[PDB]
Every structure is written in C-alpha cells, then in structure tokens.
Ligand binder design. Sequence first.
Ligand SMILES: Nc1ncnc2c1ncn2[C@@H]1O[C@H](COP(=O)(O)OC(=O)[C@H]2CSC(c3nc4ccc(N5CCCCCC5)cc4s3)=N2)[C@@H](O)[C@H]1O
Length: 431
Amino acid sequence: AKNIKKGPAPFYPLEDGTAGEQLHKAMKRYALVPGTIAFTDAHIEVNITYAEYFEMSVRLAEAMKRYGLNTNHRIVVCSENSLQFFMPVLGALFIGVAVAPANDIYNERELLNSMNISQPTVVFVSKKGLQKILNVQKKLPIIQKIIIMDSKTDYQGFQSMYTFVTSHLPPGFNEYDFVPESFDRDKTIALIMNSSLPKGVALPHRTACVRFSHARDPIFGNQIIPDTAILSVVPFHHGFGMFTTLGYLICGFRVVLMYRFEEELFLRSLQDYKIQSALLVPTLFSFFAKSTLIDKYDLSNLHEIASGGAPLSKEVGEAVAKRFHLPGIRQGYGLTETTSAILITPEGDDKPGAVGKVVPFFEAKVVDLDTGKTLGVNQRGELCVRGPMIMSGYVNNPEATNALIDKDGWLHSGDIAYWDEDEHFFIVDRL
Ligand SMILES: Nc1ncnc2c1ncn2[C@@H]1O[C@H](COP(=O)(O)OC(=O)[C@H]2CSC(c3nc4ccc(N5CCCCCC5)cc4s3)=N2)[C@@H](O)[C@H]1O
C-alpha cells in the first residue's frame, strides 16, 4: 500500500443532506445580504444577485414540484452560458429532479443522441436553441413542455421561466419558507452528463456534496473570502464548468462569465471586475501564450490562473504563467465519470507539468499496462482512481460501466500517468 496515493483530510468534514439542501442553505445565507453578486455577464454587463438567484430558483423548484416532476423525472437545460443557466439547474436539485445539461450549439443530431439517453420530460432552452429542441421533440415526444430561459414574457407561444413559475406556484408562496426536498443522496441522480458516441453519465447527489467539500477547502479549492470574483470561460454543460460553478455558488463568489471568447474583453474583464481567479480551457491557454496585450491591463488582483479538462503541456503552462507574472499555473484532472477534478494542484504547492495531487476522499494508483499490478514512484502505467465522486454508472449501459469500473470500485481512466517523490501526478500524453 506504499504505492497507493491517498487524499489528505478535508479541512471541513463532509456535510449531511443532499446537494440541493447544501446549495439551498448557502444561497439563502447569501440572499440575505443585499447586493451580493452571483453572476455577471461580461458581454451585456448585467449583474444578478444571490437574492434574485435564490428566489427564482426556489420558485422554479416549487413550480416544477406542483407541475409533477419528482425523482422519476429528468429535465434538460440546453443553453450557452448565461445569467439564467443555473436557475433551472438549482431548482431541479432542490427537488431531486435530475438535470441533463445539453451542449447548446450541438447540431440536431448530437442533441437527439444526448437527449435520447436522458429522456427528459421538460426542456429549458434559450431562444436560439428552440427550433432544434422542437425538432428533437418530433422524434422524442416524451418532451411534453418547453420553457424559454432568456425571456420574461412568453416567446413564440412557449412559456418563459417567469410565466411558467406563476402558472404553478400556490397562492401566498413564500420563497424564504420553502424547504428543499430531502432524499437519499446516494440513489437520487443529481446530474446526467455527456461523456467525451457519447454516453450518459449519472452522478448521484453525493458526488456533488463531495465536490462542495473540495470547493471550500483552503488547500484543494478557494478560501471563502469576501468580494472574491471568478472569471470563467468554461462551458457549463460539461463537468469542468458545471461543478466549478456550483462550487463557486456554494462559496458565495461572483461568477463573471463570457460565452464568446474575445482577447480584449477577457483581459479588460480581468482588470475591471478585479478577478482573483481565472478559469480557462487549455486551448485558451495556448492562446494567451501568444498574447502581447496583457501588460496593458491592471491584473494585480489576479492571484491564480487555472486549467483543466484536456492536456496542457508544461511549456505552455510556464509560458502563460510568465505572460501573467504568476509563480505558476493551477491545474486539475478529472473525467466526466469522476464528477469533477480528482487530481488538483494544492494552493501554492504548484509544480510545472503536474496536474496536482489526489484530492480528499480519493485514492489514486498507477498500474502496469500488461499486468494490473501497482507500480511505485516515477513508473509509468495506467491511472486508476477510487473515491465517492465516481459515477453510479452509464445510463442504460451496464456493460460499458463494468468495462471501466472493476468490482472493487477502481476506475480505469485510460490515461498514462506517474507520481513523483512529493506525490504530484503527471499525465503522460500518448500521441
Ligand atoms: N489536466 C488534464 N491533463 C491532461 N488530460 C486531461 C486533463 N483533464 C482531463 N484530461 C483528459 O480528459 C479526459 C476526460 O474528458 P472528460 O470530457 O470526460 O472530462 C473532463 O476532463 C472534465 C471532467 S471534470 C474536469 C475537471 N474538473 C475540474 C474541476 C476543477 C478544476 N479546478 C481547477 C484547477 C485548480 C483549482 C482546483 C479546481 C479542474 C477541473 S477539471 N474535466 C481524460 O481521459 C483525460 O484524457
């Protein structure tokens, strides 16, 4: 067991209750401080506060409950990153309805394939995705109700979130008396995510509650510090964006988003919103390695730049760190089947080329590619991980599940890795 790498102790113990209960508890607390910003849209410059966000999510929860949705139902949220995206997401977590994020700009075909797995009864969609959802509905009439996200009034005959809510709230509904549903966090699916044809990945509420431990951890996440703002350019419909944003909400952070990358807008949003931490996909890292405009901006509040979800070379990492006058790069590794990152750069413990260390509650090992036997330091082999954020299985695909997770609960990542003397993990790119 000398060669099984173990995750440290979480700074805070893992709270009880569902992921909806934990999100509801914390967002209510932030709702009660007027003017606490939850999301800022850098394109349209509008802020929405925790009070606005909490109340509309609670209203959506109760409206979905009075409509008839329960743990036997799934919704789809199909929308690019927006101020509205997490309203139906939170509302459905509050009542144990599973949420299937759909890749907003997917062509009709991949939308159909994602949604054929997830079998949603109600679809929330932004205006520019409506016609595709309509076409998917022709082939999957289990879709019985379509709700427009970025409207206040009805749009093209369909209810908005706001008119849908007032259609089903009881008289005298009180947003601050509402109690989120209580249920078995291990068996109630919180999210159905699309795999890297893609499979549906069922994630129980428990895996998000573990993520929330990491999110608030001073070592493996962000210190809950007032007036902390994040600038994230990560799609909400994949696991990297989904569970960093849910964690930032748990921490009461200001989540500044852009859904169309622009060099000047991004750098000016870093400066004007006094971003402390910036969240990029690795191909935008490759971009800012080439940028020669960073020195024009006041990035003194910038404490970290973070990457995940795809290979990042050590050289690109160091090049970006230099461009932004930072000691290094914060990084994380995970799979959709893993909920979120299970290898994370601890704060200030950064090492170039490394993806980080095993997170609290998890264990990781490297196994020989021919045998399966546990290798020691620096030996290269397959990365295997085990912990409470592993998915419960692929949706209606038990064989693909078992190919990936053996009877003892190790997940075979299909990646080549090694850990070093200080226990940092490196992912070896096959080519
Ligand atoms: N870091 C890294 N290097 C190289 N290859 C990597 C990689 N991460 C993933 N991969 C490759 O991607 C596939 C799996 O693809 P996927 O689409 O199934 O999913 C993901 O990559 C996705 C699931 S969640 C996730 C990450 N989640 C988080 C969460 C938090 C963080 N941070 C930021 C870092 C610093 C603060 C701590 C929190 C990061 C990430 S990433 N990615 C896999 O096979 C591998 O090949």
